Amino acid sequence: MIHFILLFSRQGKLRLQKWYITLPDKERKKITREIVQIILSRGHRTSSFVDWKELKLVYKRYASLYFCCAIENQDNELLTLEIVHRYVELLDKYFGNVCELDIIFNFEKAYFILDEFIIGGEIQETSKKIAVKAIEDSDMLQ
């Protein structure tokens, strides 16, 4: 189970946050700030997985924007890297050569892309065409 998904930049400011566990807002901001400082206090050769409170944090840099996921101690970390890559590919297939600016100005559309891919911390749509196709029909549905 993916507990939460965080997106942030090189400046540490958050770009997207989806939480599949229930915990209050002060603990939310504290956990997010310390996790952002843990990821940003690491180099580019540092194995892409950190250990944090019996949850392995799977992160992967793509641009100035970072991508991060937190899973339990039963999941696959490399398949969580593939889950991050599939979410980046779904952002590619929706927006079309996606940059950070599309995430910043369409955070709600990136949220819809995450909801068409992951609900409850688990994958609902494995494939790439079905999720983007469902977002396209919900976009012309209005």
């Binding site: 641009a63 100035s64 924007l65 590619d92 940059c99 950070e100 600016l101 910043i104």
Partner: peptide, 9 residues
């Protein structure tokens, strides 16, 4: 910098 493509290509 921010207008740069997310995928590595």
């Amino acid at each position: 910098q921010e207008p740069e493509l997310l995928i590595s290509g």
